[PDB]
protein (L-3-HYDROXYACYL COA dehydrogenase) (Sus scrofa), 582 residues
Amino acid sequence: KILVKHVTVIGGGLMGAGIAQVAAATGHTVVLVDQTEDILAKSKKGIEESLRKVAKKKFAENPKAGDEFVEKTLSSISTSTDAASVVHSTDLVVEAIVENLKVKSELFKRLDKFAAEHTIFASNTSSLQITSLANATTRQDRFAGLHFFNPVPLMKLVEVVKTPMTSQKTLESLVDFSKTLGKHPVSCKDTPGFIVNRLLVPYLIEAVRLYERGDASKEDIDTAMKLGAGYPMGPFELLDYVGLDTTKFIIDGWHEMDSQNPLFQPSPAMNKLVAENKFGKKTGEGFYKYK
Amino acid sequence: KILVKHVTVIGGGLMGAGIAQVAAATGHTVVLVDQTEDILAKSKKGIEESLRKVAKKKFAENPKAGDEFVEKTLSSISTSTDAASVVHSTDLVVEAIVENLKVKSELFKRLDKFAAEHTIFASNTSSLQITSLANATTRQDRFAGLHFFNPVPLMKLVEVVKTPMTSQKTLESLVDFSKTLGKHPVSCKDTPGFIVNRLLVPYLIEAVRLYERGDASKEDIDTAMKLGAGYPMGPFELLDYVGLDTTKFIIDGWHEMDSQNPLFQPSPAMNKLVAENKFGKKTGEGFYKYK
Ligand SMILES: NC(=O)c1ccc[n+]([C@@H]2O[C@H](COP(=O)([O-])OP(=O)(O)OC[C@H]3O[C@@H](n4cnc5c(N)ncnc54)[C@H](O)[C@@H]3O)[C@@H](O)[C@H]2O)c1
Ligand SMILES: NC(=O)c1ccc[n+]([C@@H]2O[C@H](COP(=O)([O-])OP(=O)(O)OC[C@H]3O[C@@H](n4cnc5c(N)ncnc54)[C@H](O)[C@@H]3O)[C@@H](O)[C@H]2O)c1
């Protein structure tokens, strides 16, 4: 196998900035690639802001050590606006840019030409096929899905999505890497939703459907799931936290890849808030209205 | 309305015992009923302990008022082998006997006679229609669902199921009662699974379906939902914990009542297990082996 040391992260937004911070904090050389040197500027700023928040907790009884952690860490993170030139020496490329088949495809198709032979490609896509992406390269044996959860620094889970073409050497390399990140890996097939989302989202909708038929109220349904099922958040809050447009996007996508399926029908009450920019907490209002 | 002071709890089983307990423990004057004397004894003995567990290790400050308290409470819990001889004065009958429509149905048709006027009837059924139980009487406006979660003394939720026949007086009556037990009531129509199980069980099966499909492993699914969703238990752990039969039951039932929904579509894998008495923990083997 291979030991991942140098990690190139493409896309420096929510997920990527996260994957960056974590890879660093656990002693990995990280190159953070995005489109504008200014995007990268803001990107890194946030990572610093997030690292300090973590430092006041992890080194609360010694701020000096705290301040060191942030410096040392944050230094292991370098940036670039052109992945093309920093990938001939990287061990792993973790992609987490716009959820768009066309765009990712071009990126990988291009990167497949520059990255070194041993380099592993991994997409953090929640809804596309890890197989489509992999076939946009001649490196399929070294391509997989590394699906993280937001916020990355906090979520201990990671799904290692394999296609029929992914070699066992690649996996082990990715499972180790994952652990080094202080995360816990679960093996999954290239199927819609992987594990979590496939069992979580259909559930969130059913709760909306149950609300639409008038059988119970939003408030009660949440209270019920939280106190009766032991869930951290009721389905209605959860949807507001992860964002309706995010969820809507995913659900419609599956719905197409299988329209005659009941579990994927569009929740009209859910297409309201979306078509009205009530996406969730991102925008201060969804099923609930936030301060 | 009615301020439920006296209570009758038909059935001293798992649920009955909790209700009986939590009830008396909250000022109410309970009465425990079952079929045999051997039974009634054990139920009350097992109550004591639980009370003490919420005593010995509970009541941090002053330990003293425990064996006193445990008596005050335990002392206000009569016991009969015939409900007919008691419903005469109670003002709330909570049934929690074997999950059988006929059996559960006749009992009610009977008690409807000997019962008092004001008296309210509630069933703790999880898989039957409250409406069809209420019609085994002529007190439909005072018959409702009272659904508790195991273990009663701990789980602080209670689903208050109303039939299109249940009266407003009868609901607020039950709500107040629910609240004076420290429990938090949520209202819901008489639909299958009410709220919780309606949203919980299809997910458990979906989990099992994902496994059967071969997409992932029992262990990974479990690790996934626990670490990614935040759930206390993985779908297969939880299933083995509530019993494959208990779960099989509920599903087949809702399936007959609607065989076209794929949600209720039974899982071969689960029948195969139940078909060879592997119900889970109460057998030491469900999807997992125990000892
Ligand atoms: N946020 C979630 O809830 C979540 C969870 C898991 C996985 N994901 C997946 O992660 C990916 C990104 O999600 P996000 O929330 O981090 O996104 P985002 O919208 O916060 O940021 C995407 C970043 O990608 C950059 N980008 C876009 N096109 C690019 C290109 N061609 N080259 C280089 N950089 C480019 C942007 O400039 C932007 O900073 C998606 O594929 C999505 O499916 C999202
Ligand atoms: N245990 C759960 O997870 C759960 C949760 C909610 C609701 N319920 C519902 O509660 C009811 C009982 O479940 P349980 O788990 O408490 O079972 P259980 O078997 O522990 O308790 C039922 C009690 O009823 C008694 N009984 C049987 N037939 C009787 C009759 N004709 N007259 C008087 N007493 C009789 C039994 O001897 C037994 O002690 C069912 O209707 C079920 O759907 C169960």
In short: Residues 37-58 of chain A form the longest helix (22 residues).
